[PDB]
Amino acid sequence: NNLVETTCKNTPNYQLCLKTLLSDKRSATGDITTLALIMVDAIKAKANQAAVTISKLRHSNPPAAWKGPLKNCAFSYKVILTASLPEAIEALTKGDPKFAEDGMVGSSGDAQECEEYFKGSKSPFSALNIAVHELSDVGRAIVRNLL
Secondary structure, three states: OHHHHHHHHOOOOHHHHHHHHHOOHHHOOOOHHHHHHHHHHHHHHHHHHHHHHHHHHHOOOOOHHHHHHHHHHHHHHHHHHHHHHHHHHHHHHHOOHHHHHHHHHHHHHHHHHHHHOOOOOOOOOHHHHHHHHHHHHHHHHHHHOOO
16 A cells, blocks of 8 residues: 555556555555556456457448458467466566566557547547556556566
């Protein structure tokens, strides 16, 4: 909480980091690694929401021009959920935190890539992509403490 405030101050979004960490009881007696793991779980929650939203859209007679965007978004979130985040959790838990930094850089970039497919047009789950990107950037910053 002092630790939580100090940690969050050294991220790109203080209040998002605060709200996210304090929502999890593990933060009260956390150390920095615990805080990074809480952050990874927050990213995972949003990424799963994104994946399900993509599936719904793909199965709901979407605009023809969203075919590629949604297919590539589906791939982007599959990378996040099956590779990037599991890698971060394992590395933080029992490995080299550099790989967790890799995973957050990956998720940050993958959410951004997904949003940019809709450039020029309405992005149907913009706020989710933005959340995954922003939370991943907060996670990168938290993990940097461990390097």
